[PDB]
Amino acid sequence: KHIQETYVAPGGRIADGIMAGKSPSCWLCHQGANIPPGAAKPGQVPAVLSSTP
């Protein structure tokens, strides 16, 4: 819901978002699995873009 409200159509208007008005779904990340296949293992993403800071 946060992804939809902030990056798809921020303020209610699609033109300001960074996506082409494409709302997310559970399937977009989870491609049929309980852990997304494209998820990075811990310690592999640049520290500035991780959960630790």
């Binding site: 960074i18 592999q44 500035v48 991780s50």
Partner: protein, 106 residues
């Protein structure tokens, strides 16, 4: 059994040309530290290049010239692919936020 992803791989990097790799190596040799970075901090040029080979341009499966200018990796505008670079920076910030205050609660 990729050491980065759970069930994904980028290894057959046929989408990256040889000139792109040569330019990457030359830029690494000529610049030990990054020249214009606003999001990726505390990393050398070699680490940034490794990230931009493995996860960026390996998660989209595109070439280094999709967002950059091969002659100068630090250039910001003047070529017809700058909007892609701007969107990519915004998508880096979004990912940081997303896994910083939503997957840190699990």
């Amino acid at each position: 059994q990729n050491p980065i992803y759970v069930n994904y791989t980028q290894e057959p990097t046929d989408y990256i040309s040889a000139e792109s790799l040569a330019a990457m190596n030359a830029y690494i040799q000529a610049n030990p530290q990054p020249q214009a970075v606003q999001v990726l901090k505390g990393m050398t040029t070699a680490q940034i290049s490794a990230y931009m080979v493995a996860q960026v341009s390996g998660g989209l499966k595109v070439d280094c010239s999709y967002c950059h200018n091969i002659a100068n990796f630090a250039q910001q505008d003047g070529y017809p692919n700058a909007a892609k670079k701007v969107t990519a920076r915004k998508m880096m910030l979004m990912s940081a936020d997303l896994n910083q205050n939503y997957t840190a609660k699990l």
